[PDB]
Every structure is written in structure tokens, then in C-alpha cells.
Design a protein around this ligand. Structure first.
Ligand SMILES: CC(=O)N[C@@H]1[C@@H](O)[C@H](O[C@@H]2O[C@H](CO)[C@H](O)[C@H](O)[C@H]2O)[C@@H](CO)O[C@H]1O
Ligand SMILES: CC(=O)N[C@@H]1[C@@H](O)[C@H](O[C@@H]2O[C@H](CO)[C@H](O)[C@H](O)[C@H]2O)[C@@H](CO)O[C@H]1O
Ligand SMILES: CC(=O)N[C@@H]1[C@@H](O)[C@H](O[C@@H]2O[C@H](CO)[C@H](O)[C@H](O)[C@H]2O)[C@@H](CO)O[C@H]1O
Ligand SMILES: CC(=O)N[C@@H]1[C@@H](O)[C@H](O[C@@H]2O[C@H](CO)[C@H](O)[C@H](O)[C@H]2O)[C@@H](CO)O[C@H]1O
Ligand SMILES: CC(=O)N[C@@H]1[C@@H](O)[C@H](O[C@@H]2O[C@H](CO)[C@H](O)[C@H](O)[C@H]2O)[C@@H](CO)O[C@H]1O
Ligand SMILES: OC[C@H]1O[C@@H](O)[C@H](O)[C@@H](O)[C@H]1O
Lengths: 131, 131, 132, 131, 131, 137, 132
């Protein structure tokens, strides 16, 4: 299982980053957004065999789509909200709801990163980059 | 043969699951429906050379389409009602009748899982996930 | 020589079956129709180098189209009425006549199996299933 | 060189067969027509390097197209009337004339086999069958 | 180098043939035309790496297009009038002139063989046949 | 695949290679100008595409071809910015640089020996050939 | 180790690209290149190197070069696109650029005169690199 950064190709310098809550990166429910690439622990990810992106911040922290379509890291489970797959430079969640669309990892403005309906995902290019 | 869980891609957390009879998940004629994924032995399946999805609850328990399009596990035989094949993420039964349609594994309501005529099957996406 | 059962995909449980005559499956001239699958010697077939389906019931017994479009097993010969080939899940005879048509292995009611014009063969899907 | 019978797929039992003359199946100029399959020396053929179909009845005996489009076996030579080639199940002569057509090996009624202009050849399917 | 006869497929028995002078097939400048196939040395040819068809009648005798479109054998040189290439069963000269047409080896009547402008070459099928 | 040392020669100008000019004759300088020059193959004309899609100059360690905000080119210490990432489509050499203008930027000769990146639809002298180059240590 | 080739025209029954040189001396830098009947001596033998230059065998370091007036010479080998050549079928194309918006093709322009010509006007521009 390769350790990578998830670097945007839609922004000259933005990597997927665990902000956390109040300086602590390791907390469950910690927010995930974007930040300049420094490759520190809170910017390193690994894709496990259940298609979860595991954070290197702490054991059992997974990239998780929330109801409001923000991103957090959470304990690892079997929910589709923690499953991801690549189509080219697009990183796509398996999360489903009533809207009949796929959700793509996407910059929504400034350093904010969420998931967005596929047709409205305009800053949604990423590169898994070997550490 | 490879043992898998059959997890829905149409529902954020649902696995094909042997309900059984009165809590007992090993009896022939036991019911099959959906449940949150946990991977225990009554959510584990294997596709044999005769195209039957054998359940890991006990020997001789094959996923079977009934006359009323509901699902059980039964002793393994040659009926097409026990035969399955994949097309992409659709899991299709060989079962035939007067209606001249193919039937697909489908979530009809909530945690109820049946087979459904292909043209009306809208929660019928599945992924065979290795255990 | 690849041994198979010929199971219908148009019927939930039917295989091509040598009924035989008077009890005996061994006999030449014996009838062929459908039965539930058990894979015993009289439901197993093998396609030889001359495109004949030879039954495991006994030596020298090939699936044969009759003029009544009924099916039997007979002594092996050169005749086209004994030649078969696949097109997807259709099993087609090389038998020719005036109707300018191809004949398909087909279920023609209940457990009865015969060859039927391609245009009219509504239950003619088959799956040759490897056996061992 | 593979020894084959030349069996029609347009008739339920007919193989290309050396008749001979008044009995003698080795006579040069002997007739070739159709007959029930039995795979004796006079029904076996080999396609040689110069595209000739040589009969097993004797040395130096090729399948030959005549002026009146019937068929005999003759001493082997260079003439295009003794050259044959396959296109699918059609067996085609290299014979040329003023009619601007290819000539196909073809059943012209009963057991009479001859060659026929391509557009007119309705019983012209053949299978070279390894004896 | 493969020795071949150049047999016509547009005539039932015609091979490309060095006529020579006075029965001597070896003479430089000797005429080339058609004859019935017998595959003696004046009907055997070899295509060399410079695209010349060399005759076996003697060394240094290449098939040559003359300005009046007749064919001779001559000493081998670099002229396009001696270069030949195949497209299907057409044998095409590299000869050029102001007419902007390719010239094809063609039977122009009886046993007369010449090169003919492509669009009029109606007896221009050939087969190179290993000796 | 091992990093191949190449020159980057224009196919839009009869003799122009991408060249580190440096500053005051010092070709090794961080932030030194890159432009065009006639081809001679010395270290300040030799480049290598690394695993992070950066074109490293042979002039010295840690020098990558970089798009500046005014679209001129320099060599700078190597990092993660898209302004140092490059990829080929045929004979076009394209920057991963992004801004608000809805365009890809291509390596392009903008006049004489000046080389910049230019919006794709205006990039008229933008053909290049990476040419394998022997380098002596 | 470059393959020896002559560059033989396919638009003329006997013409090869040929170093004429200067004052009878075929080795000289600046020497003229035009056409001649094919004999395959060294002033007609060429090799395509790894920089896409056609090197002549008359001497070390003599490359086929397009001049600004579109005539051809041999010159010291360097990086100029005026010395680079590539094939598309039987067309031999220069990488030379100028303000005219055209590719230039090796072309016979009358008699034994060989130059490069704009693609759209090059009517005697077929060639074959012929292995010696
Ligand atoms: C308590 C507190 O705010 N501490 C901050 C750290 O959060 C901060 O680390 C950075 O945090 C951002 C999110 O705002 C992002 O996650 C960066 O990757 C991470 O390095 C640190 C550096 O700015 O300053 C502390 O004071
Ligand atoms: C007697 C009785 O009802 N016992 C139940 C178990 O059935 C139950 O196990 C779960 O059963 C559901 C079906 O309703 C499904 O098959 C689950 O996968 C299975 O684990 C257990 C947990 O709910 O509770 C017992 O009391
Ligand atoms: C002296 C003389 O004319 N001898 C001839 C032979 O040339 C001739 O050979 C045949 O000639 C034809 C061309 O006319 C062709 O080249 C044949 O391949 C070649 O065999 C021979 C046979 O007719 O007769 C002699 O009289
Ligand atoms: C101090 C000074 O100006 N020295 C110059 C060198 O810069 C120069 O080298 C050439 O510089 C050009 C850029 O102008 C390009 O980088 C060439 O590759 C490089 O060789 C040299 C030759 O022009 O002259 C020195 O005096
Ligand atoms: C001094 C002088 O003119 N000498 C000539 C040779 O140049 C000449 O060689 C031929 O020259 C032509 C071009 O004119 C072409 O390059 C031929 O390949 C080459 O052989 C030679 C033969 O004509 O005669 C000498 O006198
Ligand atoms: O009518 C001629 C026939 O004579 C007999 C022979 O066995 C047959 O093969 C056939 O040639």
C-alpha cells in the first residue's frame, strides 16, 4: 500500500490536509481541507484494500464524506462515504443520495475542499503523488 | 473459489445477508435480505463453477430465487434459480418465466432485497468484495 | 474430447436427454428429449472432430435430426443431419431441406425437445456445461 | 499435404467422388461427380503446392475443369483449370474466360457436380474434412 | 533469393518467358513475352534487393521496360525501367514518363506481354510461383 | 526509466535551445533567467525530466525550470508547485501552471531569443524536440 | 554504424543525390549537392545519423544542408534545422523553417537540379533510400 500526497492539479499548490480541531490533527471528526504541500504527517494518505484513504495522522482515521459534503477523518468502517476510486485525475466518492449524481473531490474556493456533483466539479483534478 | 461479501453500491451500507429462521442462520429455506456490513459468516459468499453463490453459513446453502422473487438459501442443485452471473456491477439471475425479462438483485425497500425485472431495477448496483 | 451436459437457458431445469426405448438408453434409434438435470451418462455429450454430438450411453451413438425434426441417437455417419455447431447460445443443425432455413435445438412444449426453424425457435438457448 | 474428403454443406450426404470410365477409377479423363460419403481412395483429395487437388486414386491425377464446365481427373500440369482456392466454404477455380465471372464448385442437380458462374451457384458450400 | 515463375492469372496457361534470339535465350537485349508454362530456365526469375527481376537464362539479365513499352532482358543497372513491385496480383513498373500514370505488366494480345497504363491493364494479374 | 539528459531544441526556429542565462555570467544562481540561445549542448543547455515532472537543469543541484507569475522562465530550487511541472503532447511542452484565464500555457518563443509560456491558442512558435545528450562528468 | 544508402529519385528514371563539390573536389565544406545518374561511389552514399542529419561519405563531418536560397550543399555538421531531415513515405522533408508557412521537400527542379521546394509545389519529390 503506497503512501502518497493528494496534490491538486487545479491549484498551483494545494494538498489534501487534515486541519483537525484546535491544533490537534489526530482527533476523530477533524476537518479535512486544503493547504500548501509540505508532506508532513497530516498530508499523507494511503488507499487500503477496502478503498478507504487512511490518514497517516493516527491509526484508524479515514477520509469521510459527511452529510453536508464537507470532509473529515473518522474511524474506519464499511460505509460508502469512506470509499474512493480514481477515474483519470478525478477522485470519486461512492457516497449515494437522492440527487442521482456521483460526488467528486473538489476545491470549492480558496483553500476549501469538499465533494461536488460531477457536473459542477470544476477544480476537481488530483494526482496521487508517491512520498 | 473466492469468498466475497456482496455489498450494495446503491445504498451507503448494505450487504447481502442470511437472516435465517428465528435467529438461526444455517437452516435450509432461511431468508436472505440486507443488513449493515460486518463480514461475519452469514454475509460471505462464494461463486462456484456451476454459477451458484454458496453461503458460508454451512455446507449446501446456495442463494436461490423463489417463485415470489424473494431470496433464500437452499440445498445446491441444477436449477437456474440458483445461477448467477455478473454484467458490470449488476448481478443477474438466470431465472426464467412468462414475463420475458432478466431479473437483477435489487433493493426494493429499506433492507428488503429481492430480484426485480431489469427495466425497473434502480437500486441494483453491487460489488463483490474480497474477504 | 470435451464432455458436457446441454442445459437449457429457456427452462429453469431441463437438459438434453436420451430417453431411449422400452427402458434401455443404449439402443440405437432411441428417443431424445428433455429431462431435469442429473448429469448421468445419458445426459452427457461430446462434440467430435466431425461436428457430431456423441452420447456417453454407449459407443457409436450420435445426436441425429430426423425428417420429423425429432431427435434420436444413431450409428455415426457422414450425414449433415448429425452435424451441429454453436452461435452464441444457439445450437444449430447442418441439416438442409427445401425450406431454405437453419434448424435450432429447441424446446417445443413441456419436456419435448426437437429442432425448429430459426425464425420460430423461441426457447432455443442452451449452455454446454463442462463435466468433472 | 493433408488428405481430405470434400463434403458438401448444401446436401445432406455428398462427397466429391471420382467415377472413372466404365468402371476404372484411375483412367485419365475419368469423370468426377457426387456420391454418398465413404472416404475410400477415390473420395480422398490433397491440395498441393501448385493449388491442384490431387486424387488418391493414383499418381498424377488432378481435379480438372473442362471447356463445358464439367469435371474430370487429369495428369497434373500448369493450367489454371486445375487450380483451386478457398473463400470460406466456397471452392473456387482459377479458370478464366470471356464471361467475366469466377467459377465455383457447385451441385447442379442430383449428384451432378460441376463449376458454375459465381452469381448462379446456389449449392456451392463445401467442407474439406481431414480423413 | 526465391526463384519463381511469373504465371498469369488472366490467361489459362501463360508464363513470362525470355524469347531470346535465334533460340539462344541468353543474349542481352533479348525479347520477353508469354508462353505456356514449362518452367525451364527462360521462365525462371528472382527478385533482387534492388527490385530487379533477374532471369535464370544467364547472369546479368534483368527484366526491362523499353520506351515503346515492350520488355527485354538487359545488363542490370540502377534505372527505374528495371525495378518492379507487387500490389496484390499486380506487378507494377517504377518506370516514369511525362504521362503521370503507373505501368502494369499486362497481356496485350495472344502471347504478347508489355506494360500498360494502370487504368487499361485488363489482363494484368500475376502469381509468383516458387520453382 | 532513468532520467535522460536532453537538450530542448526548438523546431520553430532554425537554431534555438532552452538555455540558463543565469545572472552576471553565473549560470548556477537560484532564480536565474532561462531563455533561448544557439545550441551548443553545455551543462546550461542540458535538462532532465524527473519523477515529479520537473525539468532539472544540469547547471547545478536543485535547479528546476519554473514558470514565473509574469510567464517568464527561471531555474529555482525544486519543490511541489505546478509552476515547475511540465508534460509533453507531441512536440508541445506544456506547463501544469494554472490561473483564472481558462488556458493551458505552452513553452513558446515570443520573439528573437525570448522564451516564455504562452496561452495555448496564441502559442505559434511552440514546437520542441527533447534531444538525447551525452553528458561528461 | 549508419546504413549506407543512396538517395535515389523515384520521379526520374535515373537520378541520385550527388555531392558535386567545388572545383572537382568533393570533400569541401560549402560544396554543391545536385543530381546525377546513380553510380553509388562515395559522393552518392549517405547515412542518417541520430540527430536526423544526412552525412555524406565524401569526408568526415559533411552533412546535407538547406541554404537560404533553397539550394543544397554539404557543410560541417551542427544543430541547425537546415541539416535535419525526416521521411514521410517517399517524401524527404527538411526541418528548415522560415516565414513562408510551409514544409520544404527534397525536389527535382529541372534537369539534374535538386533543391528543396514548398510541399504544395513539389512535383518531382519522390525518393527511395536505397541500401548499398
Ligand atoms: C492551535 C493551532 O491553531 N495551531 C496551529 C496549527 O493548526 C497550524 O498547523 C497547520 O494548520 C493548518 C490548518 O489551519 C493545516 O492543517 C496545516 O497543514 C498545519 O500545518 C500551525 C502552522 O500554521 O500553527 C499552529 O499555531
Ligand atoms: C433469535 C433472534 O432474533 N436473534 C437475533 C439475531 O437474529 C441477530 O442476528 C442478526 O440477525 C439479522 C436478521 O434480523 C441479520 O442476519 C444480522 O446480520 C444478524 O447478525 C442478533 C443481532 O441483531 O440479535 C439476536 O438477538
Ligand atoms: C532456333 C529456334 O528458333 N529454336 C526454337 C526455340 O527458340 C523454341 O523455344 C521456345 O521459344 C519460345 C519463343 O518462341 C519460348 O521462348 C519457349 O519458352 C521456348 O521453349 C523451341 C520450342 O518451340 O523451338 C525451337 O525451334
Ligand atoms: C559576465 C558575462 O556576461 N559573461 C558572459 C557569459 O554570460 C556568456 O555565456 C553565454 O551566455 C548566454 C546568455 O547571454 C547563454 O547562456 C550561453 O549559453 C552562454 O554560453 C559568454 C558567451 O556569450 O560571454 C561571457 O562574457
Ligand atoms: C575538376 C572537375 O570538374 N573534375 C571532374 C569531376 O568533378 C567529375 O566527377 C563527377 O562530377 C559530377 C558533377 O559534375 C558528379 O559529382 C559525379 O558524381 C562525379 O563523378 C568527373 C566525371 O564527370 O570528371 C572530372 O573531370
Ligand atoms: O457410379 C460410380 C460409383 O461406383 C462405385 C464406387 O464405389 C462409388 O464411389 C462411385 O464412384
Amino acid at each position: 500500500m503506497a503512501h502518497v500526497t493528494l496534490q491538486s492539479l487545479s491549484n498551483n499548490d494545494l494538498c489534501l490536509d487534515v486541519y483537525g480541531e484546535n491544533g490537534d490533527k489526530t482527533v476523530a471528526g477533524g476537518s479535512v481541507n486544503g493547504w500548501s504541500c509540505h508532506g508532513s504527517w497530516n498530508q499523507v494518505w494511503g488507499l487500503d484494500k477496502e478503498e478507504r484513504y487512511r490518514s497517516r495522522v493516527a491509526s484508524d482515521r479515514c477520509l469521510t464524506v459527511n452529510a453536508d459534503k464537507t470532509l473529515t477523518v473518522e474511524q474506519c468502517g464499511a460505509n460508502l462515504a469512506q470509499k474512493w476510486y480514481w477515474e483519470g485525475d478525478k477522485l470519486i466518492s461512492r457516497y449515494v443520495d437522492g440527487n442521482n449524481t456521483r460526488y467528486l473531490l473538489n476545491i470549492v474556493g480558496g483553500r476549501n475542499v469538499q465533494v461536488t456533483p460531477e457536473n459542477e466539479a470544476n477544480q476537481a483534478r488530483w494526482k496521487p503523488t508517491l512520498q
